[PDB]
């Protein structure tokens, strides 16, 4: 079984600059390599087959190269539509295998998040659960850390988070983290805080409320 390794995991490129994505096969597959593009919420589409042949309708700025074990997809001048996830796939071995994908995102200047904390509603508390929500709005780059503290106790294992796709207008990310407690637990404590670490912030910012 041929193992396909793509690098880097995320490629940050300014609009108009060149993006070069690598795909390595654990054995030689000659020119038997394909590339696919997948935009969020859409199906993949074929870009390149036979390592270097562009599929019909694909813009000329996409070109594939390589042979044997080392392959390259080059996007010569990133247009707005071109920011997406790219997968390689060997077309040589009879268990077809894909790389794990390279995300190509817009590089922009560092932008600190605006941070908001939301207590659980009285309505939700009536049913015995408390959700506390922390919002990190319009930041860049994507790397950020949220820490929940309840009366200064760091919460580990009690939260889930997710992150939006890169914004089409300002190229930023946003993140939402939910801390879940029982009603009985929520009413045992007073200070609820989320602390946010990000490259745009000189020191961590904390937003909090007292129940």
């Amino acid at each position: 079984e041929i193992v396909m390794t793509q690098s880097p995991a995320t490629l940050s490129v300014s609009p108009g600059e060149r993006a070069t994505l690598s795909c390595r096969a654990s054995q030689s597959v000659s020119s038997n390599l394909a590339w696919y593009q997948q935009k969020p919420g859409q199906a993949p589409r074929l870009l390149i087959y036979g390592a270097s042949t562009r599929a019909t309708g694909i813009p000329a700025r996409f070109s594939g190269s390589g042979s044997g074990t080392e392959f390259t997809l080059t996007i010569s001048s990133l247009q707005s539509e071109d920011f997406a996830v790219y997968y390689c796939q060997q077309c040589d071995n009879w268990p077809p295998t894909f790389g794990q994908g390279t995300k190509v995102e817009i590089k922009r200047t560092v932008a600190a998040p605006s941070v908001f904390i939301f207590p659980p509603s009285d309505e939700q508390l009536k049913s015995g659960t408390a959700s506390v929500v922390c919002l990190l709005n319009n930041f860049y780059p994507r790397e950020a850390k949220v820490q929940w503290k309840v009366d200064n106790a760091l919460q580990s294992g009690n939260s889930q988070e997710s992150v939006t796709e890169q914004d089409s207008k300002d190229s930023t990310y946003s993140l939402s983290s939910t801390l879940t407690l029982s009603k009985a637990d929520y009413e045992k404590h007073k200070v609820y805080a989320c602390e946010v670490t990000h490259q745009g912030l000189s020191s961590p910012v904390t937003k909090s409320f007292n129940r």
Partner: protein
């Protein structure tokens, strides 16, 4: 133009079975090998199965072999995937995919739009919608909690409010139910005077909620 259209996805319990269909048009279907590929939410692409042009040869990835079956009706230009011995890990968008003449060492082109199969013990139900309550800018939102399966749609002010809206990907909770937040930033001076409503539609449960969010 070649078009591939999948149908049949939805919620099914482990121990159940489900049949996916892919309707093909725009090419001589029986001249081409066909394949299925799937993608778990937030994960990469995983090859599933191959079938030769005349249906005489079939291939299965070890992850589905002995459980799924591939077949084709060349008179109706349809490809099928029969899913049995189901596992929660089979939850994925399933893609119908056109191959070449021989079935081996194909690339895949084009792809259908995909159909989402959710394999879970949880039962269908609509969300509870809770407020995320708020001369500068303020944030407010709705917490769309404890629904199943995906997906849900959220708008603000019946689509009149789009600027500054972020609707987040759902998270799958340990309960087996999904939870999603949708937020919007608005002028602080409007918090008590402008009406902000989140319109939540969960089609799988025929649940619709219009929730006003106030200080």
């Amino acid at each position: 133009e070649v078009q591939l259209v999948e149908s049949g996805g939805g919620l099914v319990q482990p121990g159940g079975s489900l049949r996916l269909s892919c309707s093909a048009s725009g090419f001589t279907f029986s001249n081409y090998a066909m394949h299925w590929v799937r993608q778990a939410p937030g994960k990469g692409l995983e090859y599933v199965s191959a079938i030769s042009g005349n249906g005489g040869n079939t291939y299965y990835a070890d992850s589905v072999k002995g459980r799924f079956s591939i077949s084709r009706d060349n008179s109706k230009n349809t490809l099928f995937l029969q899913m049995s011995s189901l596992k929660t890990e089979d939850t994925a968008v399933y893609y119908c995919v056109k191959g070449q003449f021989l079935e081996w060492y194909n690339w895949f082109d084009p792809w259908g739009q995909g159909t989402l199969v959710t394999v879970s013990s949880a039962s269908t139900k609509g969300p509870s919608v809770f407020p995320l309550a708020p001369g500068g800018t303020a944030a407010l939102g709705c917490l769309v909690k404890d629904y199943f399966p995906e997906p849900v749609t959220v708008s603000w002010n019946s689509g009149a409010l789009t600027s500054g809206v972020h609707t987040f990907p759902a998270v799958l909770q340990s309960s087996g139910l999904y939870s999603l937040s949708s937020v919007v930033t608005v002028p602080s001076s409007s918090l008590g005077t402008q009406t902000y409503i989140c319109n939540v539609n969960h089609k799988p449960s025929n649940t619709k909620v219009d929730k006003r969010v106030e200080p």
